[PDB]
């Protein structure tokens, strides 16, 4: 199966002018495995999954030193951003960043990522070529020129095609029992008599891993994603996921609807009906 | 493992 690694940064200024808060969390697929939070007397990177605990103290210190340094630099970056947008010191603002690597079935790098948002909207992103930027506005264009002068893209490319894929592969081996396991969903269909000559059919998927799934309702063969309530894939808490999908049918009787579910854990797509 | 930012990496 294909896998990814991402680091998620938030640098948030405090409303007034207290020290901004910097947080970094690291994921392999949907599994959190590190966290650093700058709001502490002596902040350290901490483990969040069992399989990362085996890394020695030099690994932890390298992480911690990167994050402590980012804590300092992102504070200036925040000051830079509110300057570009003529914003005052009162008011909280945020820089969010995600970067990391996608590998495919082969274990080899499919694509690399480095995207930034300011106050919740796309600000600057590393293009797929890993050598050019997409800048949102003239302010992001100021950031682009700084990052071109500093060869950021080049160094991110080196990381992404080097360090990133290497460590991802390492974490994928160390935690293979959970990261390289795909659990199929437990599926069923619920009937909800709304009474109207109308009813809701709901197709359930429980206990799957990983999170990526497809649930669609079919009217005698045809996909109808319009008029289909498709709820968000949600953590069940025990490192599995859940999802459902619903359609309003003219039941009386009217049972020509099937639910179709695709998931990696599954040998072949399932097709299910309501069994009264 | 995260990437280290070199000097002048500010926004």
């Amino acid at each position, epitope marked *: 199966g294909s896998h990814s690694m991402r680091y998620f940064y938030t640098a948030m200024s405090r409303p007034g002018r207290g020290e901004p808060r910097f947080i970094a969390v690291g994921y392999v697929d949907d599994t959190q495995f590190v966290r650093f939070d700058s709001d502490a007397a002596s902040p350290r990177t901490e483990p969040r999954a069992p399989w990362i605990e085996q890394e020695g103290p030099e690994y932890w210190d*390298r992480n911690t*030193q*990167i994050f402590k*340094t*980012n804590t*300092q630099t992102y504070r*200036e970056s925040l000051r830079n951003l509110r300057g570009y947008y003529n914003q005052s010191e009162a008011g909280s603002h945020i820089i969010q960043r995600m970067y990391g690597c996608d590998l495919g079935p082969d274990g080899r790098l499919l694509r690399g990522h480095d995207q930034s948002a300011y106050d919740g909207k796309d600000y600057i992103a590393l293009n797929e070529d890993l050598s050019s930027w997409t800048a949102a506005d003239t302010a992001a264009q100021i950031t682009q020129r*700084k990052w071109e*002068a*500093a*060869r950021v893209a*080049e*160094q991110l490319r*080196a*990381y992404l095609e*080097g*360090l990133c894929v*290497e460590w991802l592969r390492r974490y994928l081996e160390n935690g293979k029992e959970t990261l390289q396991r795909a659990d199929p969903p437990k599926t069923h269909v619920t009937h909800h008599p709304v009474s109207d000559h109308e009813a809701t059919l709901r197709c359930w998927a429980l206990g799957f891993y990983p999170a990526e799934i497809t649930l669609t309702w079919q009217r005698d063969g045809e996909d109808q994603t319009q008029d289909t309530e498709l709820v968000e894939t949600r953590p069940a808490g025990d490192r599995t996921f859940q999802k459902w999908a619903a359609v309003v049918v003219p039941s009386g009787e009217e049972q020509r609807y099937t639910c179709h579910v695709q998931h990696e854990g599954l040998p072949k797509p399932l097709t299910l009906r309501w069994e009264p | *493992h995260p*990437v*280290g*930012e*070199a*000097d*002048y990496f500010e926004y």
Partner: T-cell receptor
Amino acid sequence: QVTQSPEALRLQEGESSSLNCSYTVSGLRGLFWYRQDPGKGPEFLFTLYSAGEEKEKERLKATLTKKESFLHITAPKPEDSATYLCAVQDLGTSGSRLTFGEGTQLTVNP
Amino acid sequence: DSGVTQTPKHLITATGQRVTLRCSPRSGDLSVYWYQQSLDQGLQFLIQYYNGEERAKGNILERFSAQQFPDLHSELNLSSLELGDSALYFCASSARSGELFFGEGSRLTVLE
């Protein structure tokens, strides 16, 4: 982390040679060559970033593998005599600090 | 050659004394890195400043200290000098493209 060899190089004028730099890092940010003359600060020569990359200027040509860099010096002259420093930046560390090898001290016999 | 300006170029002092070394980065660079080159050993990273604040360190001794001033100039203070402190002290400023540019050095000799 950075080891240079040989530490002392004794060449006849005209005798080409290659200076070796081995490095270990989490990930290479850049490999650097500097020249240092007795009593002066290191002077910039080249930076290389990726395996297979090469840079050449006059009698010096620097190349890079994933394990080492070579500074080849073709038909050297007395004036090439100096210490040659190798240094590396790491992608697992912040900022731009260099960690240096111990240098190759070259003397070219005229 | 090179832009980075270091004073004093030479220092002779006694054991137990304190000295200050001064470094101006190249115009346009915002960082100062301090290195020590001891007799028979390679350059060793001491400490980095960026735009007036401490950035990174450095196997710098507790009896050594440094600062970068709002001016960007930097000072390295060496306290309680021992004979083994005799060495060349280099500072470098980093460019946006990542290259370090070095000063001409301060040679310190400490004498009994």
